[PDB]
Amino acid sequence: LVHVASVEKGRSYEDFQKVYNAIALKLREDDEYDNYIGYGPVLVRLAWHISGTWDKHDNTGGSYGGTYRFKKEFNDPSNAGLQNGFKFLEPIHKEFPWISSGDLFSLGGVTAVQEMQGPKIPWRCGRVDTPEDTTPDNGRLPDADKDAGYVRTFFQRLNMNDREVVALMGAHALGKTHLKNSGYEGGGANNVFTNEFYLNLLNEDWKLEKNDANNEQWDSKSGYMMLPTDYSLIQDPKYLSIVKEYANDQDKFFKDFSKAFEKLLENGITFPKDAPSPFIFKTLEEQGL
Numbered sequence: 001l002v003h004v005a006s007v008e009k010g011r012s013y014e015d016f017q018k019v020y021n022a023i024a025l026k027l028r029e030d031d032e033y034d035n036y037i038g039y040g041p042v043l044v045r046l047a048w049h050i051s052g053t054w055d056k057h058d059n060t061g062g063s064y065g066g067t068y069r070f071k072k073e074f075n076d077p078s079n080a081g082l083q084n085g086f087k088f089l090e091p092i093h094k095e096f097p098w099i100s101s102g103d104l105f106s107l108g109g110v111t112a113v114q115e116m117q118g119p120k121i122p123w124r125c126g127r128v129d130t131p132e133d134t135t136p137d138n139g140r141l142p143d144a145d146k147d148a149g150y151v152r153t154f155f156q157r158l159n160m161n162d163r164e165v166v167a168l169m170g171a172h173a174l175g176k177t178h179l180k181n182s183g184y185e186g187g188g189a190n191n192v193f194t195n196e197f198y199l200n201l202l203n204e205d206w207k208l209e210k211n212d213a214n215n216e217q218w219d220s221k222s223g224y225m226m227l228p229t230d231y232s233l234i235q236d237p238k239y240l241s242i243v244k245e246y247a248n249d250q251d252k253f254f255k256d257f258s259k260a261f262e263k264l265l266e267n268g269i270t271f272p273k274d275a276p277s278p279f280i281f282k283t284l285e286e287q288g289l
């Protein structure tokens with residue numbers, strides 16, 4: 001099973017920068033969503049969940065086919081709440097109907113990370129919409145109630161190593177949990193991309209509690225929370241070393257996150273040797289917009 005990148009006909013960097021800009025302008029405009037968090041974090045989670053269905057063993061799933069647009073995937077319990085990000089993107093797609101679904105969903109995550117002052121994430125075009133019968137079954141995205149061994153094994157299926165896993169999880173500085181979506185109730189909401197996930201893990205006084213959905217989570221007196229899978233990064237000695245590294249080196253975290261997140265979004269895709277180089281989009285701020 002091979003998925004070859006195919007550039008949308010006649011398109012180049014400037015076309016995609018226009019889509020980036022439309023997403024970024026709408027992020028700025030629709031600021032009230034989710035108690036003024038805005039749509040940045042849910043777009044990051046959307047890009048990760050359309051990519052995190054990938055299976056390295058048979059190349060099923062992943063971002064290429066844009067299959068989150070189909071009912072089976074759209075209605076995955078693991079994806080509860082991402083419909084908000086889909087609705088955000090719908091007018092963007094209407095404005096730029098030439099772009100594929102997979103390219104739009106992944107570009108949404110890149111735009112959100114950069115506009116929230118995160119690292120630049122190089123991004124490649126060419127994902128191609130595939131038919132409904134290529135939609136992966138539910139159950140490929142990870143459980144939150146598990147431990148470090150579960151996290152490590154889970155991410156092997158996405159071809160991610162310990163360093164990549166710990167860097168990707170730093171996205172849990174963003175947004176919040178919602179009891180109605182996932183059975184975890186949130187605290188510590190944020191919409192600026194920093195390494196504070198790692199600082200909070202190491203510096204907060206955590207207490208294991210049972211929430212109103214009967215699930216366990218780690219709560220701090222400051223109002224932050226950690227999933228059991230988050231907290232497992234300081235229970236496992238190999239993860240703990242990397243958590244300490246990122247807590248003490250913002251630039252290293254940004255660089256490692258950028259690589260891992262681009263990789264995540266490109267897993268499963270074969271890029272022709274003549275394909276364009278990855279694009280690095282300017283932020284609105286860099287453009288004076």
Ligand code: HEM
Nearest residue numbers: 041042045048142143144168171174175176177178181182
């Ligand atoms: C073991 C791996 C992971 C688990 C178990 C997990 C689990 C969860 C859960 C339960 C939520 C709360 C959803 C809600 O209630 O709305 C959440 C939110 C979120 N996750 Fe993860 N996640 C994992 C990895 C990742 C990765 C790899 C990324 C991206 C690089 C990511 C990005 C996000 C973001 C940005 C949010 C906030 C969404 C919002 O505010 O609407 N997560 N995650």
Ligand SMILES: N/N=c1\cc[nH]c2ccccc12
Nearest residue numbers: 172173174175176188224225
């Ligand atoms: N303090 N806990 C979080 C804050 C923002 N986003 C998250 C996403 C997943 C798990 C925990 C958090």
